[PDB]
Copies of this chain bind each other. A is one copy, B any other.
Amino acid sequence: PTKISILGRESIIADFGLWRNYVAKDLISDCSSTTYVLVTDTNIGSIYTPSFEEAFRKRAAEITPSPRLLIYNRPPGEVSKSRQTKADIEDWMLSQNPPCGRDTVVIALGGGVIGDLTGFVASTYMRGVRYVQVPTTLLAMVDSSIGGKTAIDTPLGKNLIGAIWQPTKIYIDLEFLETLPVREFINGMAEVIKTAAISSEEEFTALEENAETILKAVRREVTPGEHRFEGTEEILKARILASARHKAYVVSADEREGGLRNLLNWGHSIGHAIEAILTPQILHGECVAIGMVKEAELARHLGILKGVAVSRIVKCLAAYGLPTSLKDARIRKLTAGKHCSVDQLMFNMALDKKNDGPKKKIVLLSAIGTPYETRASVVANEDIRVVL
């Protein structure tokens, strides 16, 4: 079992089968409380909550008095990361008998949507309650669940309202990947690739080599019993952990994005601008993949990044089934009639939280695994437009 520390605390426990046999117990011993609220959507719930309710009663039978478990299920989709859902969830908790108090321990069981949402609710519930992350997707395991960033979407853009609330525990259970849809898995690989590109050429090269093997396992059939990733697990764990460990480091050194944390946003300046236009038809990771390509092209444009690097980024993202341009085949049919104007994209980048005033900040890599600055660089509009 791997333990990664973040911000002076060992909130990260990684292993296989945690959900089934560890989270239930650990929660009741390290997160003493009379109330526990489980948040997840209908898809993840029907598959994973049942087993937990039992694991819960079992470990709560021994504690006096016995705490309680309350399960909230919301409509799966990047459409629940909103004000209304966060409102219903809060009201719901408040209507409970007895109500859910400041000792409430909230459990985020899901990907980035449920994670971002659950964590935000927890940050403002009665001004703050404890919560834990149980990332069930790849993207949430290698990125979203770590770091304490949470938020919701408003009609204008992505993650415009939120809070930096660190979760008390973060349980990374690789077993969840067994049931994660193919698209989702690829989608999350965008983040893994991104994390490697800003940290080490070694890790990136590793990811390039793992391509075929990893991709062949994800597409595999699997019969009720054996686990996909049969014979590729050591590789998987190694890659996932590398991503998680690096994020932990960055977050530790600059929790509130005073500068260094900007780097975790590589590909997101353009990615988010695009995502605000093509969501929900297009997933986060898929948009970020295209954003990494355009931001990379921008770095070459500025004479910061070498062309050979731009091509290698594209080839790597392509090798994982990720799109590398807004003209991509799949992405074309999925939008149906949606297209990004250079104007809209520029309008949305004005909304980039990294911006310092009206100065747009984008992460520029000077080379694979080597950022240009230890923060986002100020870039002029005209230069952005050229790659759009």
- Which residues does A use to contact B, with CB under 8 Å? 33-35, 83, 87, 90-91, 94-95, 98-99, 101-103, 123-128, 149, 151, 154-157, 159-164, 256, 350-351, 353-358
Closest chain B residue to A149, Cβ basis: B127
Closest chain B residue to A84, Cβ basis: B83
Closest chain B residue to A94, Cβ basis: B156
Question: If A87-B83, A99-B351 touch, does A35 touch B357 (CB 8 Å cutoff)?
Answer: yes
| B353 & A163 in contact (Cβ 8 Å cutoff) | no
Separation in Å of the A221 CB from the closest CB of chain B? Answer: 42
With a cutoff of 8 Å between Cβ atoms, the chain B residues found around residue A95 in the complex are 156
Q: List 12 additional A-B contacts (Cβ < 8 Å) besides A90-B161, A99-B156, A102-B355.
A: A33-B357, A83-B87, A90-B160, A91-B154, A94-B154, A99-B350, A99-B351, A101-B356, A103-B356, A127-B151, A127-B162, A127-B164
Candidate in A126, A159, A353 with the most chain B CB atoms within 10 angstroms: A126
Question: If A83-B83, A83-B87, A357-B35 touch, does A163 touch B101 (CB 8 Å cutoff)?
Answer: no
Instruction: List 7 A-B pairs, minimum CB-CB distance, nearest first.
Output: A34-B357, A98-B358, A126-B353, A127-B162, A98-B350, A94-B156, A101-B355
Can you show 20 pairs from A to B with CB atoms below 8 A apart?
A34-B357, A83-B83, A90-B154, A90-B160, A91-B155, A94-B154, A94-B156, A94-B351, A101-B353, A101-B357, A102-B353, A102-B354, A102-B355, A103-B357, A124-B124, A125-B161, A127-B149, A127-B161, A127-B353, A163-B163
With a cutoff of 8 Å between Cβ atoms, the chain B residues found around residue A124 in the complex are 124, 161-163
Closest chain B residue to A34, Cβ basis: B357
Separation in Å of the A243 CB from the closest CB of chain B? Answer: 22
Closest chain B residue to A348, Cβ basis: B99
Closest chain B residue to A120, Cβ basis: B124
With a cutoff of 8 Å between Cβ atoms, the chain B residues found around residue A161 in the complex are 90, 124-127
With a cutoff of 8 Å between Cβ atoms, the chain B residues found around residue A354 in the complex are 102
With a cutoff of 8 Å between Cβ atoms, the chain B residues found around residue A123 in the complex are 163
Q: In the bound complex, what is the Cα–Cα distance between A127 and B160 (angstroms)? A: 7
Candidate in A149, A156, A358 with the most chain B CB atoms within 10 angstroms: A358
Q: In the bound complex, what is the Cα–Cα distance between A151 and B358 (angstroms)? A: 30
Separation in Å of the A162 CB from the closest CB of chain B? Answer: 5
With a cutoff of 8 Å between Cβ atoms, the chain B residues found around residue A125 in the complex are 161
With a cutoff of 8 Å between Cβ atoms, the chain B residues found around residue A103 in the complex are 356-357
With a cutoff of 8 Å between Cβ atoms, the chain B residues found around residue A34 in the complex are 357-358
Closest chain B residue to A83, Cβ basis: B87
With a cutoff of 8 Å between Cβ atoms, the chain B residues found around residue A353 in the complex are 101-102, 126-127
Q: In the bound complex, what is the Cα–Cα distance between A28 and B50 (angstroms)? A: 57
With a cutoff of 8 Å between Cβ atoms, the chain B residues found around residue A87 in the complex are 83, 154
With a cutoff of 8 Å between Cβ atoms, the chain B residues found around residue A83 in the complex are 83, 87
Separation in Å of the A240 CB from the closest CB of chain B? Answer: 26
With a cutoff of 8 Å between Cβ atoms, the chain B residues found around residue A156 in the complex are 91, 94-95, 99
Separation in Å of the A384 CB from the closest CB of chain B? Answer: 14
Closest chain B residue to A67, Cβ basis: B357
With a cutoff of 8 Å between Cβ atoms, the chain B residues found around residue A102 in the complex are 353-356
Separation in Å of the A51 CB from the closest CB of chain B? Answer: 26
| A128 & B358 in contact (Cβ 8 Å cutoff) | no
Q: In the bound complex, what is the Cα–Cα distance between A189 and B350 (angstroms)? A: 46
Separation in Å of the A254 CB from the closest CB of chain B? Answer: 14
With a cutoff of 8 Å between Cβ atoms, the chain B residues found around residue A357 in the complex are 33-35, 101, 103
